[PDB]
């Protein structure tokens, strides 16, 4: 009944993939208790850094990537949810269920990737475990893993970036193409699709 209708919490930044040095590594910036409280209030006072955030809801954890001043992720992770910020919940700037794409204004302190114009097919996928996985581009929205691995290793990495050799953003990881549990290929949202949305 109406008086008891609940509101879904905000997406919460709980960590980041550190790409600022010679070694990629995951950092946690918020534990589970703080994540749950921050999801309910939508108020996150933590200082944000970097290009790839680790984000969570009460039910899911995945990634988000800043490109040209927008923090992007997948709709199948975030739905229509707000994201927590120092000033309270921030409403999505972009929502496109047909692309499996959402975006919010990039958090103050984040760094943005630049959309790739190289037209290169030698790509690199960054996972929530800070693995940098070579991927050969095979179409507008598909790439093959040079070294297949179980889907367990890719779970939770939707929203992460595919990068060109020069470190530009080429796309957003969306889904794993699996054969008997082994990911041989990935589906991604091309950065051009993000650029049209903007
Ligand atoms: C109403 O709006 C909606 C509602 C629901 C939707 N559910 C969608 O797909 C779902 C979720 C997505 C996924 O698991 N993503 C990744 C991830 O990590 N998620 S996550 O972070 O853990 C988490 C779930 C927390 C957020 C990186 C993957 C890593 C491992 C895979 C695990 C096994 C799953 C294999 C599957 N494989 C596949 O579908 O391959 C095919 C492809 F999609 F490529 F065509 C080939 C034929 C289908 C796959 O990958 N997913 C199934 C899509 C999408 F993504 F499909 F667009 N849109 C939606 C739009
Ligand atoms: Zn490039």
Automatic annotation (TrEMBL):
One GO process term, biological-process aspect: symbiont-mediated transformation of host cell
SUPFAM superfamilies reported for this sequence: Trypsin-like serine proteases
Any one GO MF annotation of this record: RNA helicase activity
Gene Ontology annotations for the cellular component aspect, listed alphabetically: host cell; host cell membrane; viral capsid; virion membrane
Gene3D superfamilies hit by this protein: 2.40.10.120
Coiled-coil positions: none
Keyword terms: Capsid protein, Glycoprotein, Host membrane, Host-virus interaction, Hydrolase, Membrane, Metal-binding, Protease, Transmembrane, Transmembrane helix, Viral attachment to host cell, Virion, Virus entry into host cell, Zinc
Organism domain of life: Viruses
One Pfam family of this chain: Peptidase_S29
Domain Peptidase S29: 23-198
Catalytic activity: ATP + H2O = ADP + phosphate + H(+)
Subcellular location per the Swiss-Prot or TrEMBL entry: Host cell; Host membrane; Virion membrane
Positions of Zn(2+) binding: 116, 118, 164, 168
Name of the protein: NS3 protease
Lineage: Viruses, Riboviria, Orthornavirae, Kitrinoviricota, Flasuviricetes
